[PDB]
């Protein structure tokens, strides 16, 4: 999908189960590092575009990305982390 941008495009790099696991990691971590929480029901049901917007709405843009990239590295989606980094760097 060359139609999509930003965080949403990355969440679309995740398959069905990965996305499902992504949401479980997100909720764990937000709890672990003690941020204001999103209701687990909202998180669980969210589409990729909706979750991307939930993240940015609750944590603003930079933190939504940093949180998302931490989860990727944790889920063994290190390719996504390096991809974003090669881009943001100019490599
Ligand atoms: Cl899906």
Swiss-Prot record:
Residues 1-90 form the Pyrin domain. Transmembrane segments: none annotated. It comes from the Eukaryota. Interacts with CHUK/IKKA, inhibiting its kinase activity. Belongs to the NLRP family. May be involved in inflammation and recognition of cytosolic pathogen-associated molecular patterns (PAMPs) not intercepted by membrane-bound receptors. Acts as a negative regulator of the type I interferon signaling pathway by serving as an adapter to promote DTX4-mediated ubiquitination of activated TBK1, and its subsequent degradation. Suppresses NF-kappaB induction by the cytokines TNFA and IL1B, suggesting that it operates at a point of convergence in these two cytokine signaling pathways. The pyrin domain is sufficient for suppression of NF-kappaB activity, it adopts a typical death domain fold, but in contrast to several NLRP family pyrin domains it doesn't bind homotypically to the ASC adapter, which supports the observation that NLRP4 has no effect on IL1B activation. This is NACHT, LRR and PYD domains-containing protein 4. It comes from Homo sapiens. The lineage of its organism: Eukaryota, Metazoa, Chordata, Craniata, Vertebrata. The chain holds residues 5 to 95 of 994 of the full protein.
């Amino acid at each position: 999908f060359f139609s999509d941008f930003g965080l949403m495009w990355y969440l679309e790099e995740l398959k069905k189960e990965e996305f499902r696991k992504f949401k479980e990691h997100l909720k764990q971590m937000t709890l672990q590092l003690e941020l204001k929480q999103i209701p687990w029901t909202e998180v669980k049901k969210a589409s990729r575009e909706e979750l991307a917007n939930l993240l940015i709405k609750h944590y603003e843009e930079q933190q939504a990305w940093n949180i998302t990239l931490r989860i990727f590295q944790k889920m063994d989606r290190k390719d996504l982390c390096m991809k974003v980094m090669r881009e943001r760097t100019g490599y």
